[PDB]
Every structure is written in C-alpha cells, then in structure tokens.
Symmetry: C3
C-alpha cells in the first residue's frame, strides 16, 4: 500500500508492526539519539487547507528529527482544488518531493491526491477521517493500559471524522467501541457497517452517554463544531460526574484542541486520569513510524 489514508486499508499485522516500530523509534529519540537519520536527503510537502498545531508541528519536527525537510504549504500558498486541480498538484509535487502529507476538506481530495501521486500520500485529517490521530491514540493506549485488544473505548460527542477512524481501528484490532452521540449526529452508516464486516470488534451506536461510559478504559471527546448544536449536545459534555460513572479504570482522551466549558470541563482535562498531553506527543511518534513504513524502512 503506497499511501496512509485510512487505518483499515492495512491489515492487522501491518498496523501492529507499525505501532511496535513507533515504540522503538520513540525510545531511540527519548534516549537522546540524534544520529539516526533515515530521511537524509528526503523532502515532504505538507499541504494544509486548515489551521493546525499538533499535525503541523508533529510532522515537521518528526521529519526533521529523522533527517529530512518538510515544507509547510499553508491554506493560501497553493490552494489545492481552487487555484489548481488536485491531479496537477499531485503530479508536480511528486517530481519535487519524496512524500506528501495533506489536510483537506472533502475526502475525495485526498483520494485524488493519492491516485495521481507517484510518491506516498499521508492523511493529516479530512472531513471523513483522521487516521494518524487514532494511530497515536492506539500507541497511547498500549503505553497506559498495556494494549488496545479487549478494551472498551467510549467516544462521547459528534459522530465525525474521529469516530470514523476509531471504526477503522476497530476493523483491525478486536475491542469494544461505543459512539454515544446525539440523535441526528451519528457517524456514517457505511463506515459503521464496514467495521462490523471485519467481525473483530463489538460496535455500538447510542444516544445515552451516561450508560455508555460504564466500565470504559477510555472516554474520548472532541469539539462538537452552531448554537443549535450547543442545544442538540446538551447532556453530552464530558464532566467529572461522567468520568465517575465511567469508573476508576477510565482514562480521558481528547484529540485537541479542547474548548473547556463546551464538550469538556477544565476539571476533566486537568485531572490525573487525563492523558491528553502524552496523547498529543504521540502524534509525532506514531507518524514517524508510519512515514518510515511508507518509505520502505
């Protein structure tokens, strides 16, 4: 597989191999090694249609630490799909660089980019999904809980791109995934069915978060968005009361950025069971392993 567009475009064995490599390279850098430079002489164009801190800094820093140079093409720099068609961007950037990262709106834009690029394309968020975030989240779970297999992950909030990539992961690792979301804001039926097709994981969609969280290893949230949404999502804030219902085993996770007072409270974000900051770090370690894999290392 040339590209990393969705986690279940790979098989179980490949995903676990990449998560093992993630731990190895992370250990190497944590040791202070700065002389492992597999990407010496390689470049990455990073196309960003939207703002970013974690995706941007993790990819640019990681590429640097492994010996390469990443270019930051911001929203107004190349304007993929408006100034210029995606197939043309793909064919140009594939002749300058060795790998392309892209954060876009319509998922089809990243499919187009991958289809027309002769180099690997890595997804850095689309309207549909966010696979590198969940790869990081899996690494974070392995480090804190010990493994992803047989855990209960409960996402509370909008049935959105994060939920889509949780479903991707549930398609290659057997665990229990629940999406507790307001009626009308459920994840894509097709994406839910594709996870069920894999037959590994117990997949539940519910509108009752207070029940869903019971026994969770992970309570996950993200931004909901719109004053209508605020109205629709009353009852879906992750607060200390909800974490108490979830139980003493439960970690709190959030891809960030977080809007305290909306989808989550300050008390939850700052609590000892919150692992949002190690989670954010692990974007760089998971993606380093992903890029290594795509480039034949």
């Amino acid at each position: 597989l040339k590209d990393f567009l969705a986690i279940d475009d790979f098989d179980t064995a490949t995903i676990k191999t990449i998560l093992d490599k993630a731990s190895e390279v992370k250990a190497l850098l944590k040791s202070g090694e700065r002389n492992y430079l597999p990407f010496k002489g390689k470049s990455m164009s990073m196309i960003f249609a939207k703002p970013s801190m974690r995706t941007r800094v993790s990819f640019e820093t990681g590429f640097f630490l492994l010996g390469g140079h990443a270019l930051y093409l911001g929203p107004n720099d190349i304007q993929m799909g408006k100034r210029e068609e995606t197939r043309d961007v793909a064919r140009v950037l594939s002749r300058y660089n060795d790998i392309i990262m892209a954060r876009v709106f319509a998922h089809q834009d990243i499919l187009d980019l991958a289809n027309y690029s002769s180099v690997p394309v890595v997804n850095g968020l689309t309207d549909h999904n966010h696979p590198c975030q969940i790869m990081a989240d899996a690494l974070t779970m392995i480090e804190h809980i010990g493994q992803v297999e047989g855990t209960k992950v409960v996402y509370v909030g909008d049935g959105n791109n994060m939920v889509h990539s949780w479903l991707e992961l549930a398609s290659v690792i057997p665990f229990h995934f629940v999406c507790a979301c307001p009626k009308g804001y459920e994840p894509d039926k097709e994406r839910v069915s594709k996870a069920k097709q894999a037959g590994l994981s117990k997949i539940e969609i519910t509108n009752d978060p207070k029940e869903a969280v019971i026994g969770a290893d992970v309570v996950y949230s993200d931004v909901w968005a719109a004053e209508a949404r605020r109205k629709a999502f009353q009852g879906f804030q992750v607060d200390e009361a909800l974490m108490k219902l979830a139980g003493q085993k439960a970690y709190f996770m959030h891809c960030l950025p977080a809007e305290r007072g909306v989808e989550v409270t300050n008390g939850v974000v700052e609590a000892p069971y919150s692992i949002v900051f190690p989670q954010a770090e692990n974007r760089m370690h998971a993606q380093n392993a992903i890029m290594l894999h795509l480039l034949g290392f």
Copy 2:
C-alpha cells in the same frame, strides 16, 4: 553579474554554461547522490508577494538538496513595499542571508531589491517577466528536442511576463519565436525591439494563432488572468486539440502552470502525449539550482 533578474542580462556563453550545469546536477541528484552539499551553512530568504506552488517548492526543495536552508516569507509576513520599504528589506536580509529570491508585482520592486542588496537576488516572477521559468523551459526543450537553437516556439495567449522572458531567451540563443496574441494584448514594444537588436532570432508578433503554430516545435500557453472586452478579444486563442493538429506532428505542448482547463487550454491538450507540462515543472528546480550555483560562485 550579481543577480538573475532577466535572462539577457547574461551573455550566450554564460546562459549555455548554466544550462549544462543544470543537466549535470540534475543527473547527480537522479543518481540518488545526496552528499554534494555546496550550500552547507548558507541561507536564502524567499519573498513571496503572491501564491506559488512551483516556484515555492522548487526553490525551497532545491536549496535543501544542495545543503542550505530557504526561509518562506509569505505575503503577510514582511509586506515589502507596505510595512517596510524595499531598500530597507534589502539591506536587512543581505546581513542575515546569502541570497534572496523574490516574487513581486512591480518589476521596479525587484530592481530596487537588487540595487540595495549586497547578496545576489533571484527573480521568482514579476509583472514584467519570469526568467527562471524560461530557463527551465529551455532545459526541457534541450532534453526533448535536443537543443533550443533553430527551433520554432509559438506562444498563444496574452503578451505578458512569460512572453517577455521568451524574448529574453531569443536575445541570447538563435531561434524563431512567435507570439500569437489578441490585438491590443501585444508584449511590450521595447522588449520586442531589445530582442531584435541582439540579431540572433526571428521574432514575430501576430494575431493569427492558426497560421502561427504551423511547424512549431513548441506551442506554449499561460493563464490569461473591462473583463468583457478581454473575454471577446481572446476568442480564438484557446489551445485545443485542433490547434495542436495544425501545429503538426513535431510540436510539444508546454504551459508554465497552473492551467485553467476550458479557458486558455483544453483538458485533452494538457493530458495529451505531446504535453510535457509535468517534466517542464520539475525542471524549475534543476534550472534554478544551476542558477543559484552560478550566482554563489560554483
């Protein structure tokens, strides 16, 4: 000469030497060599007044591949000519960096930048011209046709910056250059006359594209960019598959990009086997690496 602002600021021999080095260094990189790093310890500030993919990525990637660091100063980062006068930007950046690349509006802003900079200034496109693009074009022609000398290049569209740098090249290499443009949209008379003064090339301005393309080695286009009067005038100047058939069997299609299919050119032409727009785009990096090597004494 300190700067690279126009191709015919240099003589024929020097231009040909740059294009030879472009080939050599391209071949080195294609071999997989990453240990020729003459720009180690060197920096380049890249001032961009406008959006860019090709110029941006080619300059920044190539500078990296040769060992240096290029800074991207976007349109809102330093705001040359608005937040700060060009003479002051030139004198500050010349003290930080080893070379400056600039994409601006008024040509005079690039001349000012060069005049007050103690380091070399490279032109990354102005209102007047686009010399690094045509250097890359020349490399592409050498690779596909064999040579630039003795060819017939026919540009179809607005008599604009790309035409100006075609006229620059025609001042230093002898070939046949035809600009087929709507009446009213001719290139600058002084630039046309400057090419003719050099006496190397046959230079024609015409408003009949269907006659102009006959026997071309290259048919070249660019985005056209009262709006209604212009729309009217450019009827007949789209490069379509019919025009390429009139051009003949030895014609390549070139376009500096971005292309707007359905405007200056059709999908079928851009994607045709005779279209060399993607190799052309790559060669921005290789031509510009040779230019920068020259300017910094390599």
Copy 3:
C-alpha cells in the same frame, strides 16, 4: 532562570556574559566557520501573532546556523489564545520541541506560555517589552561606542515596549537613560520605578526632546490615529535634532521605519545612523541568548 522574558530577570554578570558570548559566536560566523553546530538535533517553535521581518529571519536563520530547525507558526496557523488556550499550546509544544519563541499581544500571554512550558521560552516582542531587541542594541553599542556603561541614551517617541526594555537594561547596567515622550504617552510608571529601584542608572522622563538629546551617545526611535498625530508634534527625529544631540550621537531605530513620521529619510541614511548593523545584531544577540538558555 528558564526563560528570556525581560532583561532584568537576569543579573548584571549574566547579561554581560551573554553579550560577551554574542561577540564570540558572531566572530566565529564572520570567520566563515560553519562547523560549530551545538543545536544539532534540536527544534524551536516560533509563534508569531503579528508580522515580522527582523525577529522572524534572525531567529530562523541563526537557529539554522547553529545546527537546529525552527518552525514558523504564523498568526493563522495555531491561533494561540483563540483556537486554543496558551497553557495547552505550551504543554503540547514542550513535548515536541526544545525551545519556544513567541511574539504576542498581551504580555500575560507570554508569561502563561513560560509558566506552562517545560522548555525555555524566548520573548520575540509583546505589548509590554522587547528584550531581544535591546540586547542586540547593547551589542551594537558595545561595538560602536565601546561599552554601554556611562553612556547617555535618549529615546524620542512613545513610551512603549522599546522604552520598557531600555528600562530593563538600565536596571542591570549603569548608564543615563532619557525618554522624551509626549505628555500622556509616558512609559509605565511601575517599569520606571523598577529601574530606579535597581539604583544603577540615571533615569529621566521628559517632554522636551530638543533639550533631552544634548550630549547623547544614542538617539533612539521607533514607530509611534488623528488625535495621536497632534500630540507627537515636535517628536520627530530630524537632522536638526541630531545636530542638537551633537557629534558623538549615533542614530538607532529598531525598525521598520516610517520616514516622514517618527524619523526623516535624511536621518535614517546619515553616516551616524547604524540601523542596519543594529538589525543584524538581532541574530548575534539572540544566538547567545538561546545558547545560554539551552545550557551552552
């Protein structure tokens, strides 16, 4: 001290050591040495809430010349304080990078950034001050005059962030600092008082620029809507003011300069104007600051 937020968060000896190292590393680079790379394997996130040429290019280029990679986070990239709270930005970037630079609006934003960052934070300008600029200015003065101690520095203009960082310097090196500012455009009373408490420098706030400049070693300006124009009548640095200052006076301006507003063309381009060497020294002072913060 983890961070570089204000010059007088450090003592006199440490500031002098930093300025000494600034000279040494500048000499090394001027020699053509490109093999001193202490920042190999290190990264710096640079958060910019506002446009910049000198701060941006000096930090990005100098971090490169010392072996590291600086990331340019522009105003719309992370939107610190709008898309996401400073304490969260701090905690995330501290896990990716080795050092953070930040140019912000409210000074409290850079204090919050430092308080929640486990890595050093360098100030690249706030509404309150601009310490890296004055460190560069101090280097420039050492190279042109010989030293900062015992000089007379006269700032003419708005009592702003530049004046605040001058008062910071006047708290750790003994010199004579005058701010000639319009009434109601004085620097912060607390910042003046803190410099006087240090007891090293003679510090004067005046409204009479023609008298203040007399005998200066340095006449300093910076960029200063309609009503404000009225109050700054008499505060422009022109050739006549520089004549009053006398033959010892250099002109300095942190830039960008708006000729015809706070300064004339003739002053900016005069032989006594050292604005361009001044700007270069942003890189050399900041290199030494970053070396200090990172334990070199």
